[PDB]
Amino acid sequence: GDTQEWLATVTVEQLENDPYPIFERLRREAPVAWIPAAHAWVASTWEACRTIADDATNFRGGTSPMHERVLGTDHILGAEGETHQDLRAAVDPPLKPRAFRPLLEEQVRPTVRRYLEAIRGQGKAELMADYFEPISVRCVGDVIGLTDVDSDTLRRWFHALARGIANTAMDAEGRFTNPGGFAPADEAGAEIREVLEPLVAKLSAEPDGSALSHYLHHGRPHGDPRTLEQLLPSLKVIILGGLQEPGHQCAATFLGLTTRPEQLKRVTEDATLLPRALTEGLRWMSPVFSASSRLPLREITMGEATMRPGQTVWLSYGSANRDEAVFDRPDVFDLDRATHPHLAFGTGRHLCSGSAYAPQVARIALEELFTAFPSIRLDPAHEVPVWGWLFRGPQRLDVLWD
Numbered sequence: 365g366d367t368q369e370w371l372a373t374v375t376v377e378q379l380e381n382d383p384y385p386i387f388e389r390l391r392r393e394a395p396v397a398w399i400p401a402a403h404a405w406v407a408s409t410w411e412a413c414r415t416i417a418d419d420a421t422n423f424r425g426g427t428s429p430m431h432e433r434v435l436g437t438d439h440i441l442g443a444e445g446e447t448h449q450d451l452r453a454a455v456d457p458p459l460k461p462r463a464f465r466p467l468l469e470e471q472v473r474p475t476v477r478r479y480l481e482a483i484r485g486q487g488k489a490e491l492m493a494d495y496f497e498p499i500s501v502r503c504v505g506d507v508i509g510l511t512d513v514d515s516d517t518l519r520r521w522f523h524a525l526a527r528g529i530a531n532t533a534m535d536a537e538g539r540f541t542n543p544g545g546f547a548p549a550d551e552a553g554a555e556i557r558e559v560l561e562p563l564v565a566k567l568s569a570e571p572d573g574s575a576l577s578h579y580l581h582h583g584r585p586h587g588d589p590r591t592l593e594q595l596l597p598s599l600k601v602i603i604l605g606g607l608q609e610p611g612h613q614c615a616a617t618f619l620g621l622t623t624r625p626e627q628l629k630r631v632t633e634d635a636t637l638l639p640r641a642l643t644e645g646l647r648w649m650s651p652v653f654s655a656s657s658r659l660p661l662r663e664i665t666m667g668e669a670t671m672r673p674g675q676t677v678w679l680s681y682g683s684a685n686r687d688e689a690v691f692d693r694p695d696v697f698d699l700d701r702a703t704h705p706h707l708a709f710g711t712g713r714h715l716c717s718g719s720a721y722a723p724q725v726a727r728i729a730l731e732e733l734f735t736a737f738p739s740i741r742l743d744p745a746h747e748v749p750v751w752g753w754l755f756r757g758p759q760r761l762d763v764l765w766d
């Protein structure tokens with residue numbers, strides 16, 4: 365009763381601006397809990413998240429009214445069975461190491477160095493807009509068919525879609541209380557479709573082996589390519605998270621390192637520590653903090669939570685990765701933390717398709733930054749605003765160097 369009374373007082377604003385004390389209490393008191401402000405359940409412990417994520421018998425891939433509005437109905441996150449296998453066939457192969465490894469030095473590092481040289485000329489930087497986001501959107505956009513879309517547009521798109529997903533304030537009846545918050549996503553969606561539809565039409569009839577051609581034709585009979593609507597919601601999943609998350613991994617890892625000066629110094633002197641740092645960054649401030657989700661396939665009870673079909677169950681992998689039962693002092697960033705899996709890429713059949721590629725983009729981005737500016741530090745003139753409980757990360761990351 366005490367926990368339910370407290371949850372009735374939690375606002376979306378509190379979740380966005382100060383989630384850690386909320387999830388700390390949930391992990392202790394209610395591993396799965398209904399959040400009235402969001403009209404949805406959230407799972408907060410490692411075991412609640414892992415079990416719900418993996419259990420393909422009692423839960424299906426998640427969705428929500430924001431997913432449907434922003435992405436479309438039949439997106440890969442929500443898909444199961446042959447439909448999910450088919451969408452994974454479309455998106456997965458270009459993201460495997462056998463496919464992307466040559467691009468790391470041919471494409472990714474040159475892209476990173478272009479942005480590195482731009483900030484070198486400034487003598488300081490706001491690393492989100494000036495470095496991490498352009499690198500992320502270019503390196504990912506260039507491998508998902510958006511080679512001809514400029515970085516400003518790609519950043520605008522992911523920010524708009526991510527804002528739409530986060531626009532989850534709902535009343536007791538499940539009605540949006542801020543429908544105007546979808547206007548950026550609605551416009552981004554129209555622009556995305558206007559770019560992709562002519563490419564899909566062309567490549568459907570005359571395949572060329574580019575990324576979108578594979579999305580249409582790989583694993584399909586000749587004469588039965590995927591259609592625009594079969595792909596578009598999933599392409600929007602990738603335009604949101606494929607473009608946003610790598611920049612957040614970089615920023616989370618950078619910020620975490622700044623909290624441990626001796627570890628930051630070690631990493632600047634030895635780039636081979638970056639994979640370990642990046643893994644700890646994902647655990648310490650998981651970019652997809654609670655935007656993963658499942659839906660129940662039957663009425664199912666976990667503790668006081670009796671979940672029913674159609675209801676969103678958000679999986680706070682970011683809270684799971686902060687669970688005191690699994691990690692010692694989980695609120696601390698520790699480059700040398702004892703080896704253990706994390707949930708920042710999820711688990712099971714819906715495990716992130718980008719889980720091998722994203723850490724390589726981030727590794728190269730940080731390698732170049734720390735090699736060029738080993739004296740880099742946070743700019744004390746500007747706070748580092750960290751925001752979000754669905755998607756979480758630094759909004760701005762002003763730095764100085766000597």
Ligand code: HEM
Binds near residue numbers: 650
């Ligand atoms: C560090 C960066 C990234 C993080 C932290 C991240 C995290 C996640 C998470 C948590 C999920 C949901 C897993 C679940 O529900 O259990 C997911 C799904 C997915 N991600 Fe990633 N992601 C990242 C980068 C990327 C990139 C770069 C791409 C593609 C270019 C991508 C493509 C996908 C796809 C297609 C799915 C859907 C998989 C499915 O439902 O079967 N992600 N991601």
Ligand SMILES: COc1cc(C)cc(OC)c1O
Binds near residue numbers: 431604605652
């Ligand atoms: C709702 O939106 C998303 C949710 C997740 C878990 C991952 C994504 O991208 C990989 C998304 O776009």
